Design a protein around this nucleic acid. Structure first.
Lengths: 116, 139, 685, 109, 52, 97, 74, 71
RNA sequence: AUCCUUAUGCACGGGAAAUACGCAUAUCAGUGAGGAUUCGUCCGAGAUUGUGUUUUUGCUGGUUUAAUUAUAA
């Protein structure tokens, strides 16, 4: 349990005060870790690239390669990938692309109208 | 100093080496008046009770017995030497002289480790042992 | 480093061997500002720039927060993804998940200053909590700049024994840390001397790794000493590397290598007597000390001719232009000289030409004729060459042969392992422990577990007809996952229509199965969620992890045992459910019928192993063991028919009989001679 | 008192359900072993210790988990969990039981 | 001294899986179940017999 | 803040392992440890001896005090409490650095 | 689409990224473990014969190399 | 055959068990030897078998002679 | 005769620990050891000293090819 990377305070507090209150009622990511190395993240890129090349359809892959690279890197990469594989029926690539890529009103509307 | 017995003839030395089969024989060759000879006498005097099982320590004076002077080439105020089954033992300390011993050891534990390692390597007939501590900054 | 330190141009020289030849690289001939080792003074920003960036950063954050709420919106990361590391409180600290409970932590800057008196550790950072302040420096670039300053990974590996380890590429390799190695030795009861004796091992690995640089004529000067039975020279005492080189060559290994390659070139030429018109090939007698003696050497293999040969100018293997009109002479010889090289000269060319000329011109040496071939090999850098007198059909032979000779020989293969035990460098693919025969008994602990086998996902049936050939029809597959305890099945039935419009149908299978396992595990509450998911195919290890990142508590294992779940489609009720399904579906089963009421789950699973293993083999004739008595009725509920206990006790023997007879019959092995652990090993896999 | 003797003794072995449960305290577990593996060629995962000194966990996280930064749950050994000495365990329980009658005395009053 | 037979390992339904000394553990699953269970019932039988 | 001392350690000395048992039970039984701490505050006036060592900075040799871990729990809680309430009530002025 | 042979054929084990774009094969379940157990058996009996009878193998370059050596529309 | 029953005889459990059978079995006779020897007539909870074993033990420790010589 | 309470012995079944269990031609100790307190008092059997072993005691399991003999001459 002393592996140091796991500890976060929120889950420990809401995990704790509920056990406290239960006992009373019965009585009645870390900032510390180094950022991912380009070559590991590159391994991720190759695997996910194989998985998106596995299915051109099945948007689940596109959304997955979008959100995982998002948590990893994001910025341009994800926002380009999503727009790439978004080329139509499935609404989810649009619900995701809208959320991430927008940052400004006009372009929000441009993505919304395409989904419509 | 009073704790350790002294050897007053060459035959007490030789028989002390011969009559003891199962544990190392450790002799300090030196004289009572010397500065370096009393220090290793105190160090070895504290260690004797711990080690009595696998080694025994004796004392020899050069003026009392001058017979071994030429044979083992005794110089410097003191030389500690290690004997197992009449066989002179040998260990490379880094001092460049794998024979005998010269300098004053500092800590009890470091000398007990020398005794222990020389003993353990001596049970296997191994002539040369390698100390865990190369002190050669001393010699 | 804080200091001025330059890499001299002699350190950067690095060579690489390819099947075409040996290429060299030196950057020193370029004359410019000499390459320096970087220092921190570049990589730490001044306080001024950090505070002066802090005011403007917090200003920008305030403005952006006002613009977000001004739009009735919350801050998007992409806005602040421009500046994270900038500003002293470190804006990243605003997005930490634990911040909500850090606000109640007050007075910490004082607590750290007072940790001096509660405990004995020097705390070189008493002025920062990486929780409150954040990470105030990144030295990551110092590393890449150090790697490039030294010339790259390659120019570094020329300074090591890496090429001796025999690895082709360094990608999949890892080190066994000596820190932890020192911990596992201190759980035994040991004397203080036994204790200090184990702290010199990591130094000893380090001295091996850098040995080709640490041992060279320029570093220690001194006088050469020769390790007794080897060709290794020690310039300094170097007490550790002496010991380690002695433990690398054991039981006259240097001689076994020379004798080995000689045997090899022998057995390559001896069969070629015909093609090259050779009357005889005779490997000569060996003065047993010849391999490791340096000054003088004598020919090993001798070669004769049907008439005579056409020699050429003495040259090297990989050279092209050849002229055989130079001479016509009779018979040939070969030396094979092993060399253990320093970083000074690792080049085998110059060594082979210098030794060739010296020996051929030496009076003390002994050679059958003045026509011969020297073949040198560096065992540290795994290199080779020949400076020969050449004839038609040698270089295209000797090259192709030496290619195999360096990568084959058990001698070299023994070097490479004796070395990489000393370096404790390893290869790995899967870090997780496999299921073994000895590991089997852990399956039945209290951890909830699952078995997932994809061998049935995409299937094709070939039928025999009279006229054309091979009637083939795609069929509904199934993902077969069971937990062994509750005996409960999850089958995702994969319909044929799912395969209609795609190509490269192989990888789609493994990824679809990964997805279906993710959906299946997410369907289960955290009460029912497994811990170890166990998969037969190794190719399913990567595609599961991708989908399982959301569940870090669940662990995934492969198996060395082949589990008999591919035969699960031989059960009639199951296969009927699979053939009639018109849609992808999910159907629950209990394979154990009711076996758990009368009998524990362990023996219920281990009888299932028998039932299925025999269905892999004789199939329907293993079914005639089951269906013998029609008075024994399979209900609509169950799969297997209802028996009493003893009826099963006999049936299990009959089922074991098919396994033990067909294993031997196929492999020509007698049943009776088998040891008990060999029978259980045959049943498991 | 004397050091017993340096002579090594022949090793004796037993592995039970009881005794493996004993030595579970004394062995490096699987996850703890993966900290001891340094992958050749690239930097470790290191996490800042409370004193700020980087604590490397080398292989403990799958090659994909460095990219995502999700660390791992993996398999936690519950056998090496820290537990109390016989002297401390009764002192705690005693302190709590008397604290209970204290909280009751304040409860009715 | 040899005057008393060497003791055989106690096998329970928990320990049942991990005892490989006997023949029938994995190869015959159900007869090994019967062996173990009858061993247990036999020990409890010895207890009750002693009491009576 | 008592726990983080042991996070960088692969191995545990006998005492450190005891203290980890203390922190772990303090998590597992929070109500019980709250009651125990509060009664220690109202009640316990007598404590077990503190042990001295000395750090060498090679210049300044400074005392280092090791207390018993039960007492360390109440001291940690009381410390955190006093600082939270003290700064929440704006006790220390600007010039206490 | 490439085959190896009222019989059923399944996909042979292949690594995702190492396979990448490559020809895929269809083999029989019993035939794969059949061939594997024949070869590995031949290795086991040669193990017992080598270690028992203490014979040293000729092998070397060509032998070990040759040991390294070891369509349907639907 | 000698070293087999010698180790077996040298052992304290067997050495007591051989004395156990030669002391007579009744309440009043067991009790009478104890009362004469001055040791406790009765202890808290014992079946007369256990009392008899206390005869054997007490005879063993003191190395006192048999009830023959006792009386 | 049934049923119940306490203590002790043997024992089936279920846990936890082995920084834990012991030993003493040895010093004391309900004729008061060792503690607690809200300052009125309250609890009531070990404490010292030396020593043996203590990542361990005993026992086990796995892995590292029989003889005989047949042709038409």
């Amino acid at each position: 349990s002393l592996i140091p990377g796991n500890v976060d305070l929120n889950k420990l507090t809401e995990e704790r005060e509920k056990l406290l209150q239960s006992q009373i009622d019965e009585n009645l990511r870390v900032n510390s870790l180094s950022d991912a190395t380009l070559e590991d993240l590159q391994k991720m890129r190759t695997i996910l690239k194989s998985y998106r090349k596995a299915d051109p359809t099945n948007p689940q892959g596109w959304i997955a390669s979008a959100r995982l690279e998002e948590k990893a890197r994001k910025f341009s990469v994800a926002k380009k990938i999503i727009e790439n594989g978004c080329q139509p029926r499935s609404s989810d690539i649009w619900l995701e692309n809208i959320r991430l890529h927008e940052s400004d009103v006009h372009y929000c509307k441009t993505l919304v109208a395409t989904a419509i | 100093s009073v704790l350790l017995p002294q050897l007053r003839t060459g035959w007490h030395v030789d028989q002390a080496i011969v009559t003891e089969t199962k544990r190392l024989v450790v002799i300090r060759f030196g004289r009572k008046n010397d500065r370096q000879c009393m220090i290793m006498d105190e160090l070895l005097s504290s260690i004797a009770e711990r080690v009595r099982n696998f080694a025994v320590i004796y004392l020899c004076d050069i003026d009392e017995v001058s017979d071994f002077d030429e044979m083992y080439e005794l110089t410097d105020p003191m030389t500690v030497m290690f004997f197992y089954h009449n066989k002179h033992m040998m260990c490379d300390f880094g001092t460049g002289n794998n024979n005998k011993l010269n300098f004053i050891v500092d800590d009890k534990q470091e000398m007990i480790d020398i005794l222990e390692t020389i003993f353990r390597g001596a049970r296997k007939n191994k002539g040369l042992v390698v100390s865990p501590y190369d002190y050669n900054h001393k010699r | 480093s804080a200091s001025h330190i330059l890499i001299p141009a002699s350190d950067l020289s690095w060579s690489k061997q390819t099947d075409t030849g040996i290429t060299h690289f030196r950057a020193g001939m370029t004359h410019e500002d000499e390459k320096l080792i970087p220092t921190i003074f570049r990589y730490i920003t001044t306080w001024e720039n950090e505070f002066l960036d802090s005011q403007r950063v917090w200003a920008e954050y305030a403005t952006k927060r006002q613009e977000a709420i001004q739009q009735n919106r919350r801050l998007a990361f992409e806005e602040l993804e421009g500046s994270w590391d900038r500003g002293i409180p470190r804006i990243s600290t605003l997005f930490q998940r634990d911040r909500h409970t850090l606000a109640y932590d007050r007075g910490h800057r004082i607590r750290r200053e007072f940790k001096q008196y509660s405990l004995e550790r020097n705390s070189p950072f008493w002025w920062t909590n990486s929780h409150h302040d954040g990470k105030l420096w990144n030295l990551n670039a110092y590393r890449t700049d150090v790697i490039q300053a030294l010339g790259g990974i390659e120019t570094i590996l020329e300074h090591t024994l890496f090429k001796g380890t025999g690895f082709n590429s360094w990608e999949g390799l890892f080190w066994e840390k000596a820190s932890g190695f020192e911990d596992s030795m201190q759980f035994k009861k040991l004397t203080h001397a036994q204790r200090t004796g184990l702290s010199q091992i990591p130094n000893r690995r380090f001295t091996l790794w850098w040995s080709p640089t640490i041992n060279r004529a320029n570093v220690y000067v001194g006088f050469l000493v020769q390790l007794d039975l080897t060709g290794i020279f020690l310039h300094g005492k170097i007490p550790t590397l002496k010991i380690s080189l002695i433990q690398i060559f054991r039981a006259h290994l240097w001689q076994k290598i020379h004798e080995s390659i000689v045997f090899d070139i022998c057995q390559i030429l001896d069969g070629e007597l015909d093609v090259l018109q050779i009357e005889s090939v005779t490997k000569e007698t060996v003065h047993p000390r010849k391999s490791y003696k340096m000054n003088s050497s004598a020919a090993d293999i001798t070669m004769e001719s049907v008439h005579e040969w056409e020699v050429s100018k003495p040259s090297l293997l990989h050279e092209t232009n050849d002229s055989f009109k130079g001479l016509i002479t009779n018979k040939m010889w070969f030396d094979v000289q092993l060399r253990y090289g320093d970083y000074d000269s690792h080049d085998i060319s110059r060594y082979v030409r210098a030794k060739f000329l010296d020996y051929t011109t030496d009076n003390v040496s002994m050679y059958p004729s003045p026509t011969g071939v020297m073949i040198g090999i560096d065992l540290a850098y795994n290199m080779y060459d020949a400076y020969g007198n050449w004839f038609n059909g040698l270089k295209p032979l000797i090259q192709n042969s030496m290619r195999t000779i360096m990568k084959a020989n058990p001698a070299l293969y023994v070097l490479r392992e004796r070395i990489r035990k000393g370096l404790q460098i390893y290869q790995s693919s899967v870090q997780e422990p496999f299921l073994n025969s000895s590991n089997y008994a852990e399956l039945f602990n209290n951890d909830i577990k699952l078995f997932v086998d994809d061998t049935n996902v995409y299937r094709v049936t070939v039928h025999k007809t009279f006229e054309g050939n091979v009637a083939t029809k795609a069929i509904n597959g199934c993902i077969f996952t069971l937990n062994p305890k509750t005996g409960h099945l999850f089958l995702k039935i994969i319909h044929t229509s799912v395969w209609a419009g795609q190509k490269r149908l192989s990888q789609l299978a493994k990824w679809k199965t990964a997805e279906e396992v993710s959906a299946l595990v997410r369907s289960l509450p955290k009460e029912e969620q497994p811990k170890q998911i166990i998969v037969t195919r190794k190719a399913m290890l990567d595609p599961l992890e991708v989908h399982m990142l959301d569940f870090p508590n669940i662990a995934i294992r492969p198996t060395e045992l082949r589990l008999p779940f591919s035969a699960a489609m031989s059960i009639d009720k199951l296969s009927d459910v699979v053939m009639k399904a018109t849609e992808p579906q999910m159907v629950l089963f209990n394979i154990y019928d009711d076996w758990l009421d009368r009998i524990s789950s362990y023996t219920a699973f281990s009888r299932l192993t028998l039932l299925l293993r025999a269905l892999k083999t004789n199939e329907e004739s293993a079914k005639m063991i089951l269906l013998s008595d029609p008075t024994i009725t399979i209900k609509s509920y169950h799969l297997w028919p209802s028996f009493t206990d003893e009826q099963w006790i006999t049936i299990e023997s009959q089922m074991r009989d098919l396994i033990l007879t067909e294993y031997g019959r196929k492999y020509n092995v007698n049943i009776s001679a088998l040891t008990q652990t060999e029978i259980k090993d045959i049943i498991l896999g | 008192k004397a050091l017993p003797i340096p002579e090594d003794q022949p090793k004796k072995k037993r592995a039970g359900r009881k005794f493996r449960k004993y030595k579970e305290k004394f062995r490096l577990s699987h996850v703890r072993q993966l900290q001891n593996r340094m992958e050749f060629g690239k930097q470790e995962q290191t996490v800042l210790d409370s004193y700020g000194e980087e604590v490397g966990l080398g292989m403990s996280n799958t090659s994909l988990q460095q990219a995502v930064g999700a660390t791992s749950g993996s398999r936690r050994s519950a056998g090496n969990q820290a537990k109390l000495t016989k002297v401390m365990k009764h002192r705690i329980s005693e302190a709590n039981q008397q604290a209970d009658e204290f909280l009751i005395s304040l409860g009715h009053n | 001294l040899g005057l008393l037979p060497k003791p055989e390992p106690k096998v329970k339904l928990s320990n049942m899986m991990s005892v490989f000394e006997n023949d029938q553990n994995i190869t015959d699953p159900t007869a090994w179940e019967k062996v173990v269970k009858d061993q247990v019932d036999l020990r409890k039988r010895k207890h009750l017999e002693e009491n009576e | 803040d008592l726990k983080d001392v042991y996070a960088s350690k692969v191995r545990l000395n006998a005492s450190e392992r005891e203290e980890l048992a203390l922190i772990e039970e303090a998590y597992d039984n929070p109500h019980d440890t709250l009651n125990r701490i509060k009664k220690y505050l109202l009640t316990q006036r007598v404590f077990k001896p503190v042990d001295i060592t000395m750090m060498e900075n090679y210049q300044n040799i400074s005392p280092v005090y090791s207390v018993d871990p039960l007492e360390k729990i109440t001291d940690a809680y009381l410390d955190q409490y006093l600082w939270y309430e003290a700064d929440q009530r704006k006790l220390f002025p600007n010039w206490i650095k | 689409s490439y085959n190896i042979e009222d019989t059923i054929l399944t996909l042979k084990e292949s690594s995702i990224f190492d396979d990448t774009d490559s020809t895929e094969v269809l083999e029989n379940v019993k035939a794969a473990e059949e061939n594997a157990d024949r070869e590995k058996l031949r290795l086991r009996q040669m193990n017992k014969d080598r270690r028992q009878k203490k014979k040293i193998l000729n092998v070397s370059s060509l032998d070990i190399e040759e040991e390294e050596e070891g369509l349907i529309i639907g | 055959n000698e070293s087999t029953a010698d180790i077996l005889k040298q052992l304290p459990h067997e050495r007591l068990q051989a004395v156990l059978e030669k002391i007579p079995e009744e309440d009043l006779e067991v009790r009478r030897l104890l009362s004469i020897l001055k040791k406790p007539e009765v202890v808290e909870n014992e079946d007369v078998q256990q009392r008899r074993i206390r005869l054997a033990e007490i005879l063993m420790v003191d190395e006192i002679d048999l009830e023959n010589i006792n009386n």
